[PDB]
Design an enzyme around this catalytic site. Structure first.
Site, PDB file in Angstrom:
ATOM      1  N   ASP A  10     -30.374  28.794  26.243  1.00 47.81           N
ATOM      2  CA  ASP A  10     -30.012  28.753  27.605  1.00 47.81           C
ATOM      3  C   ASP A  10     -31.066  28.361  28.442  1.00 47.81           C
ATOM      4  OD1 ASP A  10     -27.432  28.306  29.391  1.00 47.81           O
ATOM      5  OD2 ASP A  10     -28.849  29.667  30.412  1.00 47.81           O
ATOM      6  N   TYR A  61     -35.395  27.322  36.281  1.00 43.57           N
ATOM      7  CA  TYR A  61     -36.053  28.406  35.942  1.00 43.57           C
ATOM      8  C   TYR A  61     -37.536  28.062  35.801  1.00 43.57           C
ATOM      9  CZ  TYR A  61     -31.353  29.748  34.177  1.00 43.57           C
ATOM     10  OH  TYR A  61     -29.960  30.046  34.247  1.00 43.57           O
ATOM     11  N   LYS A 119     -29.230  22.616  32.795  1.00 41.71           N
ATOM     12  CA  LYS A 119     -28.437  22.444  33.884  1.00 41.71           C
ATOM     13  C   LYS A 119     -28.881  21.686  34.896  1.00 41.71           C
ATOM     14  CE  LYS A 119     -27.376  27.534  32.868  1.00 41.71           C
ATOM     15  NZ  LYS A 119     -28.727  28.011  32.526  1.00 41.71           N
ATOM     16  N   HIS A 168     -25.179  23.253  37.646  1.00 45.04           N
ATOM     17  CA  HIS A 168     -25.690  24.815  37.626  1.00 45.04           C
ATOM     18  C   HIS A 168     -24.705  25.515  38.516  1.00 45.04           C
ATOM     19  CE1 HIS A 168     -29.520  27.286  36.844  1.00 45.04           C
ATOM     20  NE2 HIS A 168     -28.350  27.831  36.924  1.00 45.04           N
TER      21      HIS A 168
HETATM   22  N1  LIG Z   1     -25.538  30.035  35.199  1.00 44.32           N
HETATM   23  C1  LIG Z   1     -26.151  30.769  36.066  1.00 44.32           C
HETATM   24  O1  LIG Z   1     -25.887  30.618  36.929  1.00 44.32           O
HETATM   25  C2  LIG Z   1     -26.687  31.778  35.505  1.00 44.32           C
HETATM   26  C3  LIG Z   1     -27.124  32.991  36.250  1.00 44.32           C
HETATM   27  C4  LIG Z   1     -27.724  34.037  35.631  1.00 44.32           C
HETATM   28  C5  LIG Z   1     -28.038  34.081  34.223  1.00 44.32           C
HETATM   29  N2  LIG Z   1     -27.791  32.937  33.386  1.00 44.32           N
HETATM   30  C6  LIG Z   1     -28.365  32.622  32.272  1.00 44.32           C
HETATM   31  O2  LIG Z   1     -27.897  34.091  31.381  1.00 44.32           O
HETATM   32  C7  LIG Z   1     -29.111  34.519  30.758  1.00 44.32           C
HETATM   33  C8  LIG Z   1     -28.841  36.013  30.683  1.00 44.32           C
HETATM   34  O3  LIG Z   1     -28.643  36.659  32.037  1.00 44.32           O
HETATM   35  P1  LIG Z   1     -29.892  37.429  32.865  1.00 44.32           P
HETATM   36  O4  LIG Z   1     -31.222  37.191  32.434  1.00 44.32           O
HETATM   37  O5  LIG Z   1     -29.516  37.454  34.074  1.00 44.32           O
HETATM   38  O6  LIG Z   1     -29.550  38.946  32.364  1.00 44.32           O
HETATM   39  P2  LIG Z   1     -29.300  39.909  31.128  1.00 44.32           P
HETATM   40  O7  LIG Z   1     -29.271  38.913  29.701  1.00 44.32           O
HETATM   41  O8  LIG Z   1     -27.960  40.424  31.358  1.00 44.32           O
HETATM   42  O9  LIG Z   1     -30.532  40.849  30.982  1.00 44.32           O
HETATM   43  C9  LIG Z   1     -31.923  40.632  30.879  1.00 44.32           C
HETATM   44  C10 LIG Z   1     -32.654  41.927  30.844  1.00 44.32           C
HETATM   45  O10 LIG Z   1     -32.052  42.803  29.979  1.00 44.32           O
HETATM   46  C11 LIG Z   1     -33.371  43.444  29.244  1.00 44.32           C
HETATM   47  N3  LIG Z   1     -32.960  43.325  27.760  1.00 44.32           N
HETATM   48  C12 LIG Z   1     -32.543  42.541  26.943  1.00 44.32           C
HETATM   49  N4  LIG Z   1     -32.244  42.782  25.507  1.00 44.32           N
HETATM   50  C13 LIG Z   1     -32.439  44.195  25.817  1.00 44.32           C
HETATM   51  C14 LIG Z   1     -31.853  45.303  25.023  1.00 44.32           C
HETATM   52  N5  LIG Z   1     -31.688  44.960  23.872  1.00 44.32           N
HETATM   53  N6  LIG Z   1     -32.466  46.637  25.510  1.00 44.32           N
HETATM   54  C15 LIG Z   1     -32.754  46.909  26.579  1.00 44.32           C
HETATM   55  N7  LIG Z   1     -32.990  45.766  27.557  1.00 44.32           N
HETATM   56  C16 LIG Z   1     -32.776  44.627  27.129  1.00 44.32           C
HETATM   57  C17 LIG Z   1     -34.371  42.237  29.285  1.00 44.32           C
HETATM   58  O11 LIG Z   1     -35.795  42.696  29.329  1.00 44.32           O
HETATM   59  P3  LIG Z   1     -37.048  41.921  28.703  1.00 44.32           P
HETATM   60  O12 LIG Z   1     -36.794  40.431  28.685  1.00 44.32           O
HETATM   61  O13 LIG Z   1     -38.202  42.541  29.248  1.00 44.32           O
HETATM   62  O14 LIG Z   1     -36.818  42.243  27.038  1.00 44.32           O
HETATM   63  C18 LIG Z   1     -34.147  41.775  30.842  1.00 44.32           C
HETATM   64  O15 LIG Z   1     -34.740  42.515  31.915  1.00 44.32           O
HETATM   65  C19 LIG Z   1     -30.240  33.997  31.669  1.00 44.32           C
HETATM   66  O16 LIG Z   1     -31.565  34.339  31.354  1.00 44.32           O
HETATM   67  C20 LIG Z   1     -29.928  32.605  32.054  1.00 44.32           C
HETATM   68  O17 LIG Z   1     -30.154  31.859  30.575  1.00 44.32           O
HETATM   69  C21 LIG Z   1     -27.159  31.913  34.033  1.00 44.32           C
HETATM   70  O1  LIG Z   2     -29.029  30.001  39.160  1.00 46.06           O
HETATM   71  C1  LIG Z   2     -29.411  30.593  38.337  1.00 46.06           C
HETATM   72  O2  LIG Z   2     -29.289  30.613  36.986  1.00 46.06           O
HETATM   73  C2  LIG Z   2     -30.413  31.893  38.420  1.00 46.06           C
HETATM   74  C3  LIG Z   2     -30.710  31.551  39.998  1.00 46.06           C
HETATM   75  C4  LIG Z   2     -29.848  32.081  41.020  1.00 46.06           C
HETATM   76  C5  LIG Z   2     -29.751  33.734  40.950  1.00 46.06           C
HETATM   77  C6  LIG Z   2     -28.610  34.053  41.966  1.00 46.06           C
HETATM   78  C7  LIG Z   2     -27.780  33.251  42.681  1.00 46.06           C
HETATM   79  C8  LIG Z   2     -27.907  31.662  42.704  1.00 46.06           C
HETATM   80  C9  LIG Z   2     -27.268  30.881  43.689  1.00 46.06           C
HETATM   81  C10 LIG Z   2     -27.369  29.725  43.405  1.00 46.06           C
HETATM   82  C11 LIG Z   2     -26.380  29.150  44.516  1.00 46.06           C
HETATM   83  C12 LIG Z   2     -25.748  30.384  44.763  1.00 46.06           C
HETATM   84  N1  LIG Z   2     -24.712  30.660  45.818  1.00 46.06           N
HETATM   85  O3  LIG Z   2     -24.341  31.884  45.814  1.00 46.06           O
HETATM   86  O4  LIG Z   2     -24.001  29.676  45.789  1.00 46.06           O
HETATM   87  O5  LIG Z   2     -26.359  31.383  44.080  1.00 46.06           O
HETATM   88  C13 LIG Z   2     -29.126  31.389  41.690  1.00 46.06           C
END
Ligand SMILES: NC(=O)c1ccc[n+]([C@@H]2O[C@H](COP(=O)([O-])OP(=O)(O)OC[C@H]3O[C@@H](n4cnc5c(N)ncnc54)[C@H](OP(=O)(O)O)[C@@H]3O)[C@@H](O)[C@H]2O)c1
Ligand SMILES: O=C(O)CCc1cccc(-c2ccc([N+](=O)[O-])o2)c1
Length: 315
Positions: free
Chosen positions: A43, A48, A77, A110
């Site tokens: 993803d 990013y 995205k 996105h």
């Molecule tokens: N569409 C959107 O708006 C949107 C928004 C947010 C996120 N996303 C996508 O979703 C993905 C995941 O969400 P996220 O990055 O917010 O957070 P997450 O995957 O919930 O958590 C990431 C955190 O957890 C830690 N971690 C990972 N595996 C672990 C394990 N087995 N044990 C302990 N800690 C662990 C990582 O540390 P380390 O990396 O240091 O190992 C990092 O600090 C994002 O990277 C992105 O690709 C999309």
């Molecule tokens: O977009 C990502 O995947 C990570 C960056 C991020 C993190 C938290 C919030 C918003 C974002 C973008 C737009 C809004 N909104 O609240 O409308 O929030 C964007």
């Protein structure tokens, strides 16, 4: 099953590697390790700022013949400053160029909020409010449909769309392709039952982001709820001889969701993939669902007056 069937006829791996906040000096090795240990879905996003480095990893593994392109499922995205119909193709092309690919498996809007185009990802007025675009999201959707028809992407979808916003896309006059996926925040503290049921009922696959509660989010406070440290979730993990993270990843899988935990730590990347050999009971699932508190990691104050801000509505 390790993949889920999308409404475009393609299969999407239910586990992928997230890359938001993955440092550019660490993400190439992270993606290489991920592919080596079995990940087949990454993803990504332009916002990013690390797609070039993700691309280096993908390209090496393709060149090495560790994996075939058809076996990978690469998602990116369209950022908010590119919602104008005339900017969509170029944004997609920049992502393809950085990732070193000739197509994406899935390209998402996105956020439903369009912002003024320019160099800044979050253009602000002098008072700190984001400056919106006037481009109708239905027009952005038509531009996304063109990408399918030009061969740049195999599927299109949406992210952070609330139920009414999903409905607006589904009700678009002359709709050509339904969104394949809605990618939304989802974890035991934000279980999203209503929105998930709605999307699934329309044949839209839901991807759960921040499944571990994004402990590395920049605005984390020491006193915030912590999924990884919740003793109730730790107890369920212990019962199954798994880690808390593994339970948090398995949970959305059993709701028929795709899940995209992020890590740049090789041991964790591997740990996070070892989630196909146990099952949470229905009782476990209902118990995890019971922890919902409508706690949201991803939402920005600067966007709360945008007409398309998605989180005023209940769902
Ligand atoms: N569409 C959107 O708006 C949107 C928004 C947010 C996120 N996303 C996508 O979703 C993905 C995941 O969400 P996220 O990055 O917010 O957070 P997450 O995957 O919930 O958590 C990431 C955190 O957890 C830690 N971690 C990972 N595996 C672990 C394990 N087995 N044990 C302990 N800690 C662990 C990582 O540390 P380390 O990396 O240091 O190992 C990092 O600090 C994002 O990277 C992105 O690709 C999309
Ligand atoms: O977009 C990502 O995947 C990570 C960056 C991020 C993190 C938290 C919030 C918003 C974002 C973008 C737009 C809004 N909104 O609240 O409308 O929030 C964007």
């Amino acid at each position: 099953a390790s993949r889920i069937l999308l409404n475009n006829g393609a299969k999407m791996p239910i586990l992928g590697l997230g890359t938001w906040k993955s440092p550019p000096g660490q993400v190439t090795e992270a993606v290489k390790v991920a592919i080596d240990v079995g990940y087949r879905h990454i993803d990504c996003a332009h916002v990013y700022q690390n797609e070039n480095e993700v691309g280096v990893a993908i390209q090496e593994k393709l060149r090495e013949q560790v994996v075939k392109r058809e076996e990978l499922f690469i998602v990116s995205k369209l950022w908010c400053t590119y919602h104008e119909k005339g900017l969509v193709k170029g944004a997609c092309q920049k992502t393809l160029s950085d990732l070193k690919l000739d197509y994406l498996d899935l390209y998402l809007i996105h956020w439903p909020t369009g912002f003024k185009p320019g160099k800044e990802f979050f253009p602000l007025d002098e008072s700190g409010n984001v400056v919106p675009s006037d481009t109708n999201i239905l027009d952005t959707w038509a531009a996304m449909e063109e990408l399918v028809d030009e061969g740049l992407v195999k599927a299109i979808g949406i992210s952070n769309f609330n139920h009414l916003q999903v409905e607006m896309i589904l009700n678009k006059p002359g709709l050509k392709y339904k969104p394949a996926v809605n990618q939304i925040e989802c974890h035991p503290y934000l279980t999203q039952e209503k929105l998930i049921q709605y999307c699934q009922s329309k044949g839209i696959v839901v991807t759960a982001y921040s499944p571990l509660g994004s402990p590395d989010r920049p605005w984390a406070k020491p006193e915030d709820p912590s999924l990884l440290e919740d003793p109730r979730i730790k107890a369920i993990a212990a019962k199954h001889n798994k880690t808390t993270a593994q339970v948090l990843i398995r949970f959305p899988m059993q709701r028929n969701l795709v899940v995209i935990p992020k890590s740049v730590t090789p041991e964790r990347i591997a740990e996070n993939f070892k989630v196909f050999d146990f099952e949470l009971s229905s009782q476990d699932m209902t118990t995890l669902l019971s922890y919902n508190r409508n706690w949201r990691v991803c939402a920005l104050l600067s966007c709360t007056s945008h007409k398309d801000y998605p989180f005023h509505e209940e769902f």
